[PDB]
Write a protein of this length. Sequence first.
Lengths: 48, 50, 97, 153, 65, 257
Amino acid sequence: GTYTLIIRLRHNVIKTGVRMISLSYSRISLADIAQKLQLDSPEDAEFI
Amino acid sequence: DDEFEEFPAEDWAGLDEDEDAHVWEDNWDDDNVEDDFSNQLRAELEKHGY
Amino acid sequence: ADGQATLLNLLLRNYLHYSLYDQAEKLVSKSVFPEQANNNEWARYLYYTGRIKAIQLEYSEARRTMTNALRKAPQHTAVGFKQTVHKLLIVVELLLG
Amino acid sequence: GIISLLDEDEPQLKEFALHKLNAVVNDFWAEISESVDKIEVLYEDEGFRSRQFAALVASKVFYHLGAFEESLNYALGAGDLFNVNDNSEYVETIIAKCIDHYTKQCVENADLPEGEKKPIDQRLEGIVNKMFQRCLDDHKYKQAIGIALETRR
Amino acid sequence: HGLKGLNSKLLDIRSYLEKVATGKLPINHQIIYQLQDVFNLLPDVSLQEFVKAFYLKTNDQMVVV
Amino acid sequence: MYEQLKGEWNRKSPNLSKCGEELGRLKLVLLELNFLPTTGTKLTKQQLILARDILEIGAQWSILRKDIPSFERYMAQLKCYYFDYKEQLPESAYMHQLLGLNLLFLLSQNRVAEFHTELERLPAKDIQTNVYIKHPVSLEQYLMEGSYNKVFLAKGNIPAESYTFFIDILLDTIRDEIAGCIEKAYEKILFTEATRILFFNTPKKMTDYAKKRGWVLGPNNYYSFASQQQKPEDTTIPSTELAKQVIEYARQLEMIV
């Protein structure tokens, strides 16, 4: 009876990754962001 | 004491052979689930042709 | 006092057993709890109140409420519910970050 | 969530729900705790057919919110409708408060009883006496004397 | 107590400066000179690198606490 | 007994004043049958379904009339019918369609507190199944993160119907957010990306959009400057807060509690 709370973690998996990716890199190409975060496309990478 | 039986107690089913029995400063950096280091290096030379 | 502490957990419990979270949060906001809760009923109150805030995006207090329940929970016994309290806390922490 | 139907501006349809709440004002009162104060709004409404049955619900809801001052205020609004069934486990909770409020009012009046005293509500005064007579009709005299002294009457 | 004294001494200066409207003594001159130097000596506005220096020391005292 | 609804209820009404047909019914039910839970009379199951039918049909015309306040009053009633603890049919004909219709509404009103507290009424249909509710929930996650190109993709894929009575509400909750994000200290952005990005090719909406927002008009030059530097770097205001803080340490270190 806890799966309801887990399906909402998808946002956190990106927040943590974006935090570390922005913490370790200084100027990373927008396309490269999608590949490391498995965003599936660069167009939506900008918004998140 | 006043133990709570309403919450089910999950079966232990633990390994009682002292698999690790070690006390360290264990952090979360020890479980990156990477395939050793020799393997990654070993394929590195061949992948780049060197 | 000394009796409504046990009742509050029980009445709280039935709400959790079903998905009746909407009207569960109403009772917590209104009803208060005794200061002398025997240190045993207080363990349950924190857990249930922890999950109620957990589902409603009130994470910040969700983690603190549970961890207080963890330390006030019996150590030697009550092993069954230690797993459940631990499981939700790690999930609540993960959402927090 | 049955109290949901309280805003269609239909005087007869509204009251039908209010009838139902009292029977379910304990099992799931919580939802009607603070998000719905329209009971008082309708209790001031000129629509009539109400202002005494809403007070029954209005005071009952405030019973367990703890604000006995609010519960006492609306409880008298039902007048003869409220405390008619003087045999129950609820009537004693408000009545025990009516005597509580009256005694705290009577004493403050005694300081300046020569005019410019607070206008003690008539409806409350009648309730305590009605309780007072119930003491006499019960023949129990020991309790009767003290409450007279406490009330300063 | 220090704040009480500072206010009283400051109030004493204000009372003398009542001569601006109703002259008592025709501007002592020297008293003004010191007052000008007093203002210049006021600590420099707390917006520059001073603020960082304060935090690096106020917090350093908190560790010991 | 006193259906009153068999006349033309099934057919469509293009904004017809069909509310009148309903009014005479919802009154007569309570005299006819009590729609309160009424745990008593468990075996009598026939009576309610007529009451439920009078109810779930309410949403059909309502949602089409752009009735916000009237809408909520109906969702409160109908849900209880689906939830009754008395024995009834396990699932209606519109089990999931209507429920999500409420859930999607809650997100539209930017009330996520009630959205998550409402999913538990649906045990395991959130993602695995119940195509009716999978889309409304998916909309929540997408909005929670910055992923918006999916939102318009889902905007064209709706499980129940056009649902346009709500998508219009999301427009207010999306464009205002997108503009706010872009408001940071970025550099010039030409009127070519922001114009053909979301759905439109070359409208005048941005011109109005720019007018009510900032984005000073220049030589095809848009600026978004954010300093947030003059306000910081001050301790005088911290001085009063700090003074109170330390005194409390002194207070709770000397005097007996």
